[PDB]
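Record type: ASSEMBLY
Status: queued
Input:
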Amino acid sequence: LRGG
Amino acid sequence: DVFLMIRRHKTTIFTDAKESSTVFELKRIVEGILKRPPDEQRLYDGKTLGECGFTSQTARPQAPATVGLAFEALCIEPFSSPPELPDV
Amino acid sequence: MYVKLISSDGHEFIVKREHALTSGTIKAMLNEVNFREIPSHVLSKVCMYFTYKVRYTNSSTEIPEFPIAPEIALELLMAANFLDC
Amino acid sequence: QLNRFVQLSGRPPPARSGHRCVADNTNLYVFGGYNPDYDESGGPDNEDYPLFRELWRYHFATGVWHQMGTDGYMPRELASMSLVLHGNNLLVFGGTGIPFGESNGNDVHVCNVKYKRWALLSCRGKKPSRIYGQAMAIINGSLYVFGGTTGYIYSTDLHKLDLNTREWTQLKPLPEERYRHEIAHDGQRIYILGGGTSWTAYSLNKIHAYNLETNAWEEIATKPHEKIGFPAARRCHSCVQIKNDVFICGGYNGEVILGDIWKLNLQTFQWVKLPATMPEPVYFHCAAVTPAGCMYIHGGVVNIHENKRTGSLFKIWLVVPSLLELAWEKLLAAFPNLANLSRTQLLHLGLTQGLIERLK
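Status: finished
Output:
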């Protein structure tokens, strides 16, 4: 669940 | 599809036409605008614009070419010259 | 179905009404419309842009750039600001 | 050759990803950013590595990048936050710090660009849980926030905040749970575009629209292209809106980075594939649109295997510009020294107050  | 500016004296008419359109069609539409029969005017007859040199490449709507309309010799008054102003 | 405009020096520009309706100021004004300040070399380009924008609006293909000479850039900008186009 | 991608330049900020950007007629405001590369991200000078706690702005007239020295308390959620522009203010909501999901945000910060100040809204009510990757919109002077995971569990709430009274509430009416999607609106309905989980990307051939008046969701089947088909399913894309038109740009489905751009008309729901392909296809980037109608794209991830970011900035014209805009661009290109002249000199030249304010 990467935000970048 | 070509675009045209009919020029005569201080008068300019913006219009569009097809490459398959004839000179008579142009005369008819300018008759519709400024009320002058086609027989009384010439432009610089029945040959269509395809062989008249009005290609779609050079007659783009951002720079249509001009045709000289006479009812007498041609008379096209040039537009006002731009002024000169220093960089500063 | 054609709208008639007059430049500052007396030149005459006849355009389609739909093309001239592009500018908000002309629509608000509205036949003949007299422009007492816009010179001929600017009104010509304004009609040029009217035709170009009307033809190329909502077009999928690429839109060619509008050629503007550097000299008339300032006055054309002024006219575009005034005409709301 | 005006509706193509043109790369801009002129000190540019380092490569970043996960940031957001908004635009007005004068500047392009970029907030947030994340980059794990030590050497690329300013080295030890960046005390917030791998997060970019910097707010930058690109000046359209001069083509210069300026890092704002704002005051107040800059929010710590600098990755996958949500940012909008209201009048002359930047509204920031949501987002996560580092590592992802460790500390998310659920409050609202406001930054005034003219005053260059930061503040926190004192909204009361039942606020959404701490989420990131959600999407917000401003409709009828109210804030609508949808989606966004909490880090381990997804969300589907459609919270609404009244800015006049600063009152939070939850909208109770179903679309699948998703994050990093995009929002479109037309004043009567809110349309969901793209998005997905970490294991799937949802198709764009069917759009979920929530109706404000009827307070219920609906499904709309968009029409396809003539011979191209529907846009490929994607997430972490970018979306902008011009009148009743929605442009989707970039993103990836999990294994392939998509570098195409599509347009959807909110009235006829017909897809159009613009004949422009990015010089460098990226995802997780930021995109914004100007009132004139020019779209700017910055940041993102270029390589999906090497995990390579970029700092390239691109601009594109989506509609036919007004004569004012064309004249302005030509004048700025022809006479670069115009920026040096003072306001009085430009007024003597004849430029209006708004044009001078844009240029200076």
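Annotation: The longest strand of chain C covers residues 2-6.
Annotation: Chain C touches chain B through 32 residues (CB under 8 Å).
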